[PDB]
Ligand binder design. Structure first.
Ligand SMILES: Cc1c(CO)cnn1-c1ccccc1
Length: 209
């Protein structure tokens, strides 16, 4: 059972704007995704100060950067609060319509793509370097779901059958054929130290063969 949904008209034109606009400062995607992971970890930590039973699905709060050359994927793993099914379909799409409309008005006013985080839609910066994005997430109050989109105005959602996460969000970036630089160890270490040095959670960058 794989359900296919259509993006909102405002989210669709933002995606095509990110896909089609010539813009060479593409590395800002990792800051936006790590900043998105840091917010999810803050929310589960806050909910735990008044309820220590919410870490039952995992006490550790960290962020993992796992590059893969054989599959040509960069994965950002966090043990944050996760996202529910209503989040993946209705909720965040409604929150993002205002920041989207504000982001375009800023772009015609002189702003550039790197300012996408101050409008709450920084996740779509992943499509600067990805031709397809997979999101595996697990919320304490919901099952494990798989989100996927390759632009075009549509996305899919299904119940994931893979490895149980316990709690968190896994963002898999299927890198474009000409964007394999973000699979290199020394490159990722440079973007992290430059853009996300003050993230208050341990960031472990994995290495491969
Ligand atoms: C996290 C997020 C926002 C807020 O920036 C807007 N859309 N999304 C999102 C991401 C992945 C899948 C479905 C929706």
């Amino acid at each position: 059972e794989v359900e296919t949904f259509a993006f909102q008209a405002e989210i669709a034109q933002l995606m095509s704007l990110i896909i089609n606009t010539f813009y060479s400062n593409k590395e800002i995607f990792l800051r936006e995704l790590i900043s998105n992971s840091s917010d999810a970890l803050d929310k589960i930590r806050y909910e735990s100060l008044t309820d220590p039973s919410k870490l039952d699905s995992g006490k550790e709060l960290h962020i993992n950067l796992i590059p893969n050359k054989q599959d040509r994927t960069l994965t950002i793993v966090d043990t944050g609060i996760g996202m529910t099914k209503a989040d993946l379909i209705n909720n965040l799409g409604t929150i993002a319509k205002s920041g989207t409309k504000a982001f375009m008005e800023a772009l015609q006013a002189g702003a550039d793509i790197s300012m996408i985080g101050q409008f709450g839609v920084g996740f779509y910066s992943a499509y600067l370097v990805a031709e397809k994005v997979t999101v595996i997430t697990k919320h304490n109050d919901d099952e494990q779901y798989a989100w996927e989109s390759s632009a075009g105005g549509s996305f899919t959602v299904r119940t994931d059958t893979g490895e149980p996460m316990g709690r968190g969000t896994k963002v898999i970036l299927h890198l474009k054929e000409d964007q394999t630089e973000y699979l290199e160890e020394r490159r990722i270490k440079e973007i992290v130290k430059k853009h996300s040095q003050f993230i208050g959670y341990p960031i472990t960058l994995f290495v491969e063969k």
